[PDB]
Amino acid sequence: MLDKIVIANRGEIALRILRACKELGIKTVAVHSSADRDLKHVLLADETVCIGPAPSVKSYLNIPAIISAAEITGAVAIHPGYGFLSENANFAEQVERSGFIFIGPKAETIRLMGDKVSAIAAMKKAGVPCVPGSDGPLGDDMDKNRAIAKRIGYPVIIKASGGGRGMRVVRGDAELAQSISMTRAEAKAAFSNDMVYMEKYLENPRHVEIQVLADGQGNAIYLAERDCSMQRRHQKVVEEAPAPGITPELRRYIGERCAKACVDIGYRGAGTFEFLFENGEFYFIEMNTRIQVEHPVTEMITGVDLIKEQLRIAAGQPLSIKQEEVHVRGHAVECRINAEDPNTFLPSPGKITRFHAPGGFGVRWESHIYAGYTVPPYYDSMIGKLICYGENRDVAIARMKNALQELIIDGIKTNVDLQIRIMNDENFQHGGTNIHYLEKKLGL
Ligand SMILES: Nc1ncnc2c1ncn2[C@@H]1O[C@H](COP(=O)(O)OP(=O)(O)C(F)(F)P(=O)(O)O)[C@@H](O)[C@H]1O
Numbered sequence: 001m002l003d004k005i006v007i008a009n010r011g012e013i014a015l016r017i018l019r020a021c022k023e024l025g026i027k028t029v030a031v032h033s034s035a036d037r038d039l040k041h042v043l044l045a046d047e048t049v050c051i052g053p054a055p056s057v058k059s060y061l062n063i064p065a066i067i068s069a070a071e072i073t074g075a076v077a078i079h080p081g082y083g084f085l086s087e088n089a090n091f092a093e094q095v096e097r098s099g100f101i102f103i104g105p106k107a108e109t110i111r112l113m114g115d116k117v118s119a120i121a122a123m124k125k126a127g128v129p130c131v132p133g134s135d136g137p138l139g140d141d142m143d144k145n146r147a148i149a150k151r152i153g154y155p156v157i158i159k160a161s162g163g164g165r166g167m168r169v170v171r172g173d174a175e176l177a178q179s180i181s182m183t184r185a186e187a188k189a190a191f192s193n194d195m196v197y198m199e200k201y202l203e204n205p206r207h208v209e210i211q212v213l214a215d216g217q218g219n220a221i222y223l224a225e226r227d228c229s230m231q232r233r234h235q236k237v238v239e240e241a242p243a244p245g246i247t248p249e250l251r252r253y254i255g256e257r258c259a260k261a262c263v264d265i266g267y268r269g270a271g272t273f274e275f276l277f278e279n280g281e282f283y284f285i286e287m288n289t290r291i292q293v294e295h296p297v298t299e300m301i302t303g304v305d306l307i308k309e310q311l312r313i314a315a316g317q318p319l320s321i322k323q324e325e326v327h328v329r330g331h332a333v334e335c336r337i338n339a340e341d342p343n344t345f346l347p348s349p350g351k352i353t354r355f356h357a358p359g360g361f362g363v364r365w366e367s368h369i370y371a372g373y374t375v376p377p378y379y380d381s382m383i384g385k386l387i388c389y390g391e392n393r394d395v396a397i398a399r400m401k402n403a404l405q406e407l408i409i410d411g412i413k414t415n416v417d418l419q420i421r422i423m424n425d426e427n428f429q430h431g432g433t434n435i436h437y438l439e440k441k442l443g444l
């Protein structure tokens with residue numbers, strides 16, 4: 001078992017990872033910016049190293065600084081969390097070249113799945129259902145590009161192969177040329193890569209993703225699914241597991257092909273296969289080769305600690321469970337808590353004056369915040385995650401409502417009130433709302 005790791009992240013997920021390490025007797029190294037000296041996980045850690053000033057580029061994206069910390073503390077591995085460098089192939093590779101364990105997949109695998117064209121080709125090859133598309137990049141020949149639009153059939157969507165998002169719906173030949181030029185130029189200026197591709201556009205899909213784990217002994221398993229349809233500007237607001245309306249037959253179908261994909265591609269560690277789900281059909285869109293924000297819902301309904309499994313896998317230990325031992329039991333819902341303005345949706349940083357966490361049965365609170373903690377302006381608005389579990393969806397929802405009424409966070413503006421409205425929303429209670437629902441309810 002791993003002796004000592006660098007938690008190369010901050011806020012809630014850093015605390016999340018810290019608790020996993022403590023449980024397993026792993027020593028913790030908290031790397032942090034000068035603005036994060038008083039983070040809960042920093043104050044609990046065994047060793048702390050300050051890697052640079054507030055802005056991410058000189059702290060949480062500073063590759064040399066994070067590797068030095070590892071070297072000077074005698075750490076053996078680096079857990080990158082989500083965001084920051086977690087999907088950075090160059091970083092994972094430098095971690096490996098320097099002789100530390102990247103808690104995550106092989107760099108090569110990260111690079112394969114971080115380009116959408118090559119990711120879709122691999123999934124398609126492994127029998128995972130994808131969206132009909134160009135199946136390869138588009139050149140600058142508009143006669144050919146129109147032929148591809150007709151073959152797919154309108155509406156189509158144009159998409160950068162790298163990845164905020166940068167996409168364009170097209171509904172006829174007239175808008176096609178101009179939508180390609182613009183998408184192309186916006187990917188050149190963003191990821192330096194001007195490659196684009198075309199997919200069939202789905203009007204009312206839901207977002208359903210499959211959690212997987214794969215170890216170094218050939219084992220690969222799926223841990224049911226999550227629905228993260230409730231979104232704003234393509235940012236998830238609420239996630240839940242299992243996904244309403246997914247039968248055990250569908251679960252077993254899409255899960256088995258996700259696991260087979262892992263085997264074919266030599267995947268390792270925790271991963272998420274993201275799908276658009278419409279008319280009872282799954283269509284692949286993206287693989288996240290990392291732990292995700294919304295992993296605690298899958299944990300509540302399976303009993304499997306996903307972070308601890310990451311640490312075990314990275315150490316050479318085989319998965320603690322087989323597929324046959326994974327049972328979906330009950331139902332969990334996650335509400336993201338954001339230090340945000342209720343009318344602008346721009347971050348509202350500031351000093352938390354009073355704080356109270358909810359508690360009780362089936363209630364799990366994932367956050368670093370505390371009374372007197374200042375939320376800095378330099379990072380994401382998500383200060384916390386509230387997860388509620390119940391024997392069925394209706395119980396999970398009802399616990400959420402009460403847990404929210406109890407959550408106290410004074411001194412800054414938060415989305416607690418908005419979450420409460422969504423939990424009271426009669427369509428959410430029916431289940432199965434699409435990815436556009438939250439924006440149509442708010443009028444955005
Ligand atoms: N074929 C399609 N039809 C309709 N909508 C689509 C299609 N493909 C993508 N989308 C939209 O784009 C979103 C995903 O876009 P994209 O994957 O580029 O964002 P990303 O930021 O890369 C991410 F969210 F996936 P992640 O942060 O998980 O990587 C979906 O929520 C969906 O609304």
Ligand SMILES: [Cl-]
Pocket residue numbers: 082083291292293294
């Ligand atoms: Cl995420």
